Every structure is written in structure tokens, then in C-alpha cells.
Amino acid sequence: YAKKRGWVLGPNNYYSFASQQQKPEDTTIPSTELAKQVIEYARQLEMIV
Amino acid sequence: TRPANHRQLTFEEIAKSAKITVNEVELLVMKALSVGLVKGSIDEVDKRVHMTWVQPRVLDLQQIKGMKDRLEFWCTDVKSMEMLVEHQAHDILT
Amino acid sequence: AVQKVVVHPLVLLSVVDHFNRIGKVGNQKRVVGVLLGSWQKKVLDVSNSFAVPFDEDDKDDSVWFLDHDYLENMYGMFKKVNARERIVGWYHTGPKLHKNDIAINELMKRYCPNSVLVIIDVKPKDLGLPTEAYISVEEVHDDGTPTSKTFEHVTSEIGAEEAEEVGVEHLLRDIKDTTVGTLSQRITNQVHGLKGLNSKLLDIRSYLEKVATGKLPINHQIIYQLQDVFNLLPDVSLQEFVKAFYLKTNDQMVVVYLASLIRSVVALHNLINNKIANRDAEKKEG
């Protein structure tokens, strides 16, 4: 596991790499696809005509 | 300098640029709000000043260039979304 | 101190009349007449108007002739038939205005103190472009720039009267555009509401790249008038929009959820009553 992956034994301590990202801010990706979902409602509130 | 990206500026940047101490940055911005050069507010739970700049002026051709590129981005984003609306709702346009 | 003008839908028809009252032999390609109005308090109103013989030579572009005697009689004739209407200014057509319009204006200010002009469009009518009005103002220019006229713009609107609006609906008779729309007129109001948007935005960069090159000299007036557009558009980040947008979006999805529930029970009941009436006429025909 030390030669393939990380887990480097140093001063009697392993070190596994780790992070995280952040995304609550994007109202923009539910802006385009929601606009598609609202129109395809109103497309189908008519058109069997 | 920052085109309204993160307009909430902290005390360190004013104290560095205006070479004024930290005990005078609050008296400095109340004088600016008194005159009418800006209409922002002051927060001290993070020691950061919110800024809504309302007093414009002259600029050079160098700020004209990025203004057009933001305008060209402004042009191509609105036109692309009209093409998505015109294609999607053409059958109910009439 | 003019807020806006109100152009009734009668006077522009008289211009389209007088645009055709000269085009049989005239090559003037502009129509100049006298605008009559009813200045009430602060908003301006235009009820009736008329025209006047006017020519203009392209050479030296400073020669003009107005008929004052025809202006004195016919306005005096209108006062006798209607002592309500009076002068408010003048009008001319053609998008490209000639430069006698200061010379015409500064003469007939002896009639009207707050003299006003209205520019209409007879041929440029394809896109969304209404009539246009300016105002007679006299300043130097800005601070230290040489003196000129600088006709300032006053915004314009269209308003009819009671018979002037009901008589319009009887004339059209072709599409008639009913009130509150059934999802088809409303989306097109957002379609061609946006077709005029980028037509303005293409026009801003066209003048900007004209002056970013530097052919025509700058006007500082339009610079900060453009600069407060870009640093006053909203920026949607957190807890001011993304919280508060779903609070009214997940609100309005509850009431259209009734439309899912109710309309499905409507057509189901119409299915039951037909399938009862079908099989009972079928079982009793034989």
C-alpha cells in the first residue's frame, strides 16, 4: 500500500490525503433545466390540438 | 479595482492602501457615506465593509476593453437563451 | 420640466396622410407641420394638429421657408371651432434630422414658451420603435466645452381617449389580441420582449466600438450614464436569493399541483359518463 498508494509511514503516523468542495451557490444549473420543466408543462397543458 | 465580484472589503485592505490605522477606518467611511460618494454599510462581526458604489466618474480605454468583453459575454449569453426559448416553445408560439 | 408627452392616436394618422399628401410630385422626403396640444399641469397632451408648406434645399442646409399667414389663420380658425386646443410646438418626420431644426425652433418659440418637437417614423416601422420627442433647452454645454444646443430627450407614451380607443377596436378586425392571455400570447410577450433587448445591446457596443476606436470625440455624459448600469445589476450569491427564490418557487409549485389533481378528476368523470352512455345505448339497440 505504500509503494502503490500513499499511506506513508513517517514518525509513526500515516497520512491519507483528503479534501472537500463546496456547491450550494449554483441556482444557475436549476435555472436552465427548471425553465425547460416549466415550459414542457405549458407545452402539454395544450397540444392535443 | 474589483468589478463588483466580492465588493465586501475587509479592514486590512483600506488600512494598507490609505495607510490609515484600524481605529480610523470607521470614521473614514462614515465621512464618505455623509458626503454621498457611496451608499454602503459597515459590518463588524467580520470587520468587513459592504459597498454599493453609486458615484461614477471617467475611465480610460483600458477599462473600455474589458467592458466590451463583459458586454460580448452579456451579448452571447442572452442570445443563446433566446435560441433555447424559441426552439422549445415554437409549437405554442402562434 | 416636462415629464412625458401623450400622443393621441389621431395626429400620427394626419402625418401619414400628409406624408402621402405630398409624395405624388414632391421629392422633399420630409414632412414638417405644426403640433397643437393641451398643456394641462405637467404632463403634455396632443389632441389635434395640422401641417404647413415647408421646403429645404440640401445645398448649404440653412435655407428654409415657413408660411406664417397660413399659421395665423388656420390656428385662429381652430380656436373659433374649439377654444380648448392651443399650440404646443411642431413635428417632423425622417430619422435623420436636418440642422434647420434649431432655426425652426428658435423662431416659433414666440408662439410657445415650452416649445416641443415630435419625431415620428413612417418607413422605419418594422421593429419596436415608437415616436420620439426632444425638448428645447439652452445651456453652454457641460463645464468647459464649447457652447451648443444639445436637444435633451423627453420620454414619450401613447394614450387614447374613450371614443378614440373604442373606435380603434372596430377598425382592426384581424387578430384583435384578447386580454389576459392563455399561455401563448404571454410567452411571445417574453419572446419579442427579448428581441428588443439585444437589439439595444448590439446598439450599445456599436457606438462603443465606434468611440473605442476614436473616430468621433467622446461625451463624458454617456460614460457615467453607462457606468451605473454595470455596477448596479444584482449578483445572486447566498441567503438573499438562493434561499428566497425557492421560498416563492416551492410556493407556486403547490398551487399548480392542484391543477395536476383537479384536471385529472375532470376528464376522468367525463370518461365515466361516456362509457356508461356508450354501453347502455349499445346493449339496448339490439
From Swiss-Prot, chain A:
Q: Which domain of life is it from?
A: Eukaryota
Question: Quaternary state and partners of this protein?
Answer: Component of the 19S proteasome regulatory particle complex. The 26S proteasome consists of a 20S core particle (CP) and two 19S regulatory subunits (RP). The regulatory particle is made of a lid composed of 9 subunits including PSMD8, a base containing 6 ATPases and few additional components. Interacts with DDI2. Interacts with TASOR.
Record's function text = Component of the 26S proteasome, a multiprotein complex involved in the ATP-dependent degradation of ubiquitinated proteins. This complex plays a key role in the maintenance of protein homeostasis by removing misfolded or damaged proteins, which could impair cellular functions, and by removing proteins whose functions are no longer required. Therefore, the proteasome participates in numerous cellular processes, including cell cycle progression, apoptosis, or DNA damage repair.
Family that this chain belongs to: Belongs to the proteasome subunit S14 family.
Q: What is this protein called?
A: 26S proteasome non-ATPase regulatory subunit 8
The stretch of the full-length protein covered here is: 302 to 350 of 350
Curated annotation (Swiss-Prot), chain B:
- The shown range, given as first to last of full length, is 283 to 376 of 376
Q: What does this protein do?
A: Component of the 26S proteasome, a multiprotein complex involved in the ATP-dependent degradation of ubiquitinated proteins. This complex plays a key role in the maintenance of protein homeostasis by removing misfolded or damaged proteins, which could impair cellular functions, and by removing proteins whose functions are no longer required. Therefore, the proteasome participates in numerous cellular processes, including cell cycle progression, apoptosis, or DNA damage repair.
Query: Looking at the record's lineage, which domain of life comes first?
Result: Eukaryota
* Family per similarity comment: Belongs to the proteasome subunit S11 family.
Q: Assembly and partners? A: Component of the 19S proteasome regulatory particle complex. The 26S proteasome consists of a 20S core particle (CP) and two 19S regulatory subunits (RP). The regulatory particle is made of a lid composed of 9 subunits including PSMD13, a base containing 6 ATPases and few additional components.
Residues carrying N6-acetyllysine:
K16
Descriptive protein name = 26S proteasome non-ATPase regulatory subunit 13
Gene name linked to the record: PSMD13
Curated annotation (Swiss-Prot), chain C:
The domain of life is: Eukaryota
State if Repeat is listed as a keyword. Answer: no
Ranges for domain MPN come to 5-140
| Keywords noted in UniProt | Acetylation, Isopeptide bond, Proteasome, Ubl conjugation
In alphabetical order, the GO MF annotations are: protein homodimerization activity
| GO CC term (a single one) | membrane
Its annotated function is as follows:
Component of the 26S proteasome, a multiprotein complex involved in the ATP-dependent degradation of ubiquitinated proteins. This complex plays a key role in the maintenance of protein homeostasis by removing misfolded or damaged proteins, which could impair cellular functions, and by removing proteins whose functions are no longer required. Therefore, the proteasome participates in numerous cellular processes, including cell cycle progression, apoptosis, or DNA damage repair.
Miscellaneous comment as given in the Swiss-Prot or TrEMBL entry:
Does not bind a metal ion.
- Protein name (record): 26S proteasome non-ATPase regulatory subunit 7
Lineage, highest ranks first: Eukaryota, Metazoa, Chordata, Craniata, Vertebrata
